Structures are given as structure tokens and as C-alpha cells.
Amino acid sequence: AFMALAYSNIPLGATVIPSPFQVHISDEQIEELQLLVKLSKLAPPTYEGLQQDRRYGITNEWLANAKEAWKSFDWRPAESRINSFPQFTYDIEGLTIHFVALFSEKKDAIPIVLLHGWPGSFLEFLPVLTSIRDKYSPETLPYHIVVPSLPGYTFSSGPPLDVNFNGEDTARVINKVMLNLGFEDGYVAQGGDIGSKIGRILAVDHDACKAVHLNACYMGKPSSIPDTAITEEDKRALARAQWFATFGSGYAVEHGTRPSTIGNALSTSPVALLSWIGEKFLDWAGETIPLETILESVTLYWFTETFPRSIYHYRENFPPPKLRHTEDPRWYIRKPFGFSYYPMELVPTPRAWVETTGNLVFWQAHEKGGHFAALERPQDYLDDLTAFCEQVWAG
């Protein structure tokens, strides 16, 4: 049905008109989820499950309380809030690509694509979009904001069943979203987690991406630095990165080597999926992420069968590459490159490290916030993004 929605006017110059989209999870799926949560079995007490500091992952107590809360969680109000933002799909290379958008009425608005990672989604950016639409009407909005679901995530289909699919394919398909909307003349990319790899690939390989801002730059100490110049904050950063490599990367190895096994396993029960993903919302955040937010994201993954389709990126590091992606001259960013440092990112990277990976024209450090920067610190994230775009955009 025709549905007028503010901020939904397709930019002049779009070559393909996207199909309007709204989320409508069926009643039977909602009923079913309540049943499957209720009847899920819980592990018995173990030494590891009783460690309240989560040294061995989620606690039994956390999971039992989350299961109880989930019984009464109501998807419909969350769905209504999602549907207050314009959403669309395109058909690109046989994939359905879902995206959220805020479109300006200004002919020369700055186009921006925001790129989520794993185990996130477009949901990570809705607080940011809320701030944007409260500050700007469609007529005063300086930007077009496009928040796509990566292939394999939520309402995006795929990846294909008959061919391998990697980060370069992801970037090519996301670039086509922006080209379809008429942004061949240029757009800015922003990414964290896997989205930071996609954003780097867009900036390095695709003409339409003119600049990129990242809040993650996964790398070791670059070989081109001969020194050890070491400050207290640099101490915390190296310690957290070392914690992540030794104790925090089980999911990377499992996703990267046996994605079919873990995808089959976590499809069986929503509480299996909650265990796996909840650990990351708890451990990776600087600002505590509310249980309701965790349940919302895991519920969305459950309804859309996201998890088994979402982990294809991880195998690109098996066997270990000759050079890490960020440390490879093949992927050095020559275009204007910005970075924001959040101290509880998984691998917090000092400026001197990041500078070895591209033409770093913008640097902003923060005192608060971790891996889920937009979700945890939406206004800090937005202030960085708009400052970067206004600094680098050349019309």
C-alpha cells in the first residue's frame, strides 16, 4: 500500500527507484519465539558458569534472567519504532538489499553510508538517525543517510548459495546501492567492525566513495614503526588488544573455520543464539548495553535467520593472510581518511598505527565508549561524522 513517510523522497538523479519496505514479522513467528524460549533447556551449574566476572563467558545467572525477561519481551513496539524510519530494498546481483534511509530535499546534500558489523545490524544506528531527524527536517537536512543491511543480515538476502562471497563482493554490492540512488558523483562511508573493512574497500577500490571515516582499524603494531613510544592510554590499548587476541577470539576462529557447524548449532534454539551473541554485547561495550537492546537484536537475528548467513567474512583470515588487511599497501587509503578512537574498542589503535594505513586527515579521541560506538555514544558518533564530512567534502 502507498505510505507517505517523511524523509523518504528518493534523490533526484537516482537511476533505480527502490521498493519501499516495512518490517512485518508474522504473528505465528512471535508466538513461536515465546514457546521456544520457554522450553529451551539451561545448562546445570558449573564452575565456569558461576564466574560472575564473565572470565569464561556469560554466566548461568545472566542467561536464566535473560530467558525470563525474553518470555515477556514484546516485539511489536520495537517493530513500530523501526518502521518510523524510511526503509527500502533494491535487487542487486540477485540479492535483496535492505536499507534504512533519511533523504534530504537538498539537491546537493552530502550522501553518507553507515556500515554495521557482527553481531550488529542497522539497529545500531537508529539512535543516531533519531538525533538527525530531531535536528533537521527533510528540508534542512545536510546529508543523505543510508544504513544498509549487509548481505546475509536481517532483511537482506543471501549471500548466494552457489559461490563464495567475500568483503570485496560486499563492498561492490553496497556501492551499487549508492550508485542506484544517484550518488556516482560521490559519497562518504563510515564503518566499524566488519563495516570498517567494507568501508576501507569502498574507499580504496570504488570511485564513488570519496572519503571514509572508521572507528575500528584492526591491526597489530605495524612493521613500519621501529619504536616503542608508550603512554598510559597506549598501555591500556595494547593490553586490551592482547586480551582480545588471546581470550576473545574464539568466535573468530569458529566462524572462520567451521561456519556451517556453528550456524547449524545456533539455529536450533533462540537461547543458543542468545548465549553466543549476548557475550559480545556484554564484553565489547564501554557503556553498558541494556538487556532490552540485546534481546531486540537477538530477536531480529532469530526472526530473519541471520546468524548462519552472517559469518562468511570471518573465513577470509584462514589461513592467516600474508599481510593483515589494514597493514597491506593494497588497502592503504589514499582518499581523505578519518578515525575516531574509542578506548573500549576490541583492538584500540593509537594514531601513529592508524596513520600507517592511510591518508589520515581527521583524528578524534574519546574518553567514553567502546566497540558499539554509534549505539553506545550516538551523539559523540554523530558529532564526529558530521565534523568529518564538513571538513573533507569538496562539493
Nearest to 87 by CA among 5, 195, 15: 5
Q: CB under 5 A: which stretch of 184-192, 233-241, 246-254, 300-308 binds Cl ion?
A: 184-192
* CB closer to Cl ion out of 275 and 293: 293
C-alpha distances in Å from residue 257, one per residue of 11, 315, 320: 42, 6, 11
By DSSP bridging, strand 87-92 and strand 187-191 are: unpaired
Active-site residues, by number, are: 193, 314, 371
Q: How far apart are CA 113 and CA 126, in angstroms?
A: 13
d(CA 341, CA 343) in angstroms, rounded, equals 6
CA–CA gap between residue 257 and residue 263 (Å, rounded) = 12
Q: Which does 192 bind (CB under 5 to 8 A by kind): a copy of itself, Cl ion, Na ion, none?
A: Cl ion
The amino acid at 301: Y
Asked if 97 and 148 count as a contact pair (C-beta separation under 8 A), the reply is yes
Nearer to Na ion, 116 or 313 (CB): 116
DSSP secondary structure letter of residue 97: E
Among 22, 249, 359, 364, binds a copy of itself (CB under 8 A): 249
18 binds a copy of itself (CB under 8 A): no
Give the separation between CA 113 and CA 138, rounded to whole angstroms.
17
Nearest distance, CB of residue 50 and a copy of itself, angstroms: 6
Instruction: Please list every residue from 128 through 157 that binds Na ion, using CB under 5 A.
Output: 147
Residue 319 contact partner, candidates Na ion, Cl ion, a copy of itself, none, CB within 5 to 8 A by sort of partner: a copy of itself
Q: Are the C-beta atoms of 307 and 301 separated by less than 8 Å? A: yes
Distance CA 192, CA 190 (A): 7
Smallest gap from Cβ 135 to Cl ion, in A, equals 19
Q: Which of 120, 192, 350, 358 binds Cl ion (CB under 5 A)?
A: 192
Q: What does DSSP assign to residue 25? A: -
d(C-alpha 266, C-alpha 286), whole Å: 26
- By the 8 A CB rule, do 324 and 221 touch? no
Q: What residues pair up with 370 in beta bridges, in sequence order? A: 344
Q: Does 346 bind a copy of itself (CB under 8 A)?
A: no
Candidates 196-204, 216-224, 267-275, 338-346; binding stretch for a copy of itself (CB under 8 A): 267-275
> At its nearest, how many Å lie between a copy of itself and the CB of residue 18?
24
Of 215 and 299, CB closest to Cl ion: 215
By CB under 5 A, tell whether 378 contacts Cl ion.
Answer: no
Phi/psi for 301 (5° steps) reads -60, -45
Query: Residues 105 to 124: which contact Na ion by CB under 5 A?
Result: 115-116
d(CA 380, CA 377): 5
List binders of a copy of itself among 32-91 (CB under 8 A): 35-36, 39-51, 54, 56-60, 63
Binding segment for Cl ion among 24-32, 51-59, 65-73, 185-193 (CB under 5 A)? Answer: 185-193
Which residues in this chain contact Cl ion in the complex, by CB under 5 A? Answer: 192
Which residues in this chain contact a copy of itself in the complex, by CB under 8 A? Answer: 35-36, 39-51, 54, 56-60, 63, 159-165, 246-251, 253-254, 256-269, 271-273, 275-276, 279, 305, 308-309, 312, 315, 318-319
Which residues in this chain contact Na ion in the complex, by CB under 5 A? Answer: 115-116, 147
